[PDB]
């Protein structure tokens, strides 16, 4: 079974190693079965994002209470389907931003399993 922690890294972690989002949404099996309407990639280290689980406890958008907000803003890419996007030809607008991230955390080690929001 893919673990929940591995799925968060596959969906949202692209630590550095206009067309950014079209390249990245296919690679991660996020355009493989359907066009995921919105996805955010985080360009900070896995350690800095995992650290958010020890930062400010906040309510998730849905009302779950195991979410955590990063104290600093972080470098992120929002990928959003464009009007011409239609599976299986998915297509995305890229908007780079610097925002606090909010993640839901689970497990031991206690790590992100869900990307909830950026603000």
């Amino acid at each position: 079974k893919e673990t929940a922690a591995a799925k968060f890294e596959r969906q949202h972690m692209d630590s550095s190693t206009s067309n950014y989002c079209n390249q990245m949404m296919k690679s991660r099996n996020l355009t493989k079965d359907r066009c995921k309407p919105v996805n955010t990639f985080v360009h900070e280290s896995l350690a800095d994002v995992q650290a958010v689980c020890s930062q400010k406890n906040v309510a998730c958008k849905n009302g779950q209470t195991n979410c955590y907000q990063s104290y600093s803003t972080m470098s992120i890419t929002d990928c959003r389907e464009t009007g011409s996007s239609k599976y299986p030809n998915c297509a995305y607008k890229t908007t780079q931003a610097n925002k606090h991230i909010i993640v839901a955390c689970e497990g031991n080690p206690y790590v992100p399993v869900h990307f909830d929001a950026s603000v």
Epitope: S54, K56, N57, Q64, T65, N66, Y68, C105, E106, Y110
Partner: nanobody
Amino acid sequence: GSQVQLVESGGGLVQAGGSLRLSCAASGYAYTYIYMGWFRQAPGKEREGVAAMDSGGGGTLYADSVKGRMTISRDKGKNTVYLQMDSMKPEDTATYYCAAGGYELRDRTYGQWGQGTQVTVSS
């Protein structure tokens, strides 16, 4: 203190039919944990959620097996949680753990855990 600690007190040895109070206070965390709760692991069993409550005194949930004998409260301070246990049963013998920062009785969602307090209910 750079580290967060969930300090547990109370618990220990009691007769079947008796009463005990567990208390937990977090130190080292600068904000308010929205949910805190008590979990336990009894001999022969997996860890299970016993009781949980949110920082406004609501969202209260209990394991069905302890409902009506145990009472959780938080109203005595920031990041504190207490468990009053009455009419105790042999099946309540367990290591009890304070936990903070999760949601309801879902133990995977809690990221801070006390070291564990033994509670032994003598037959």
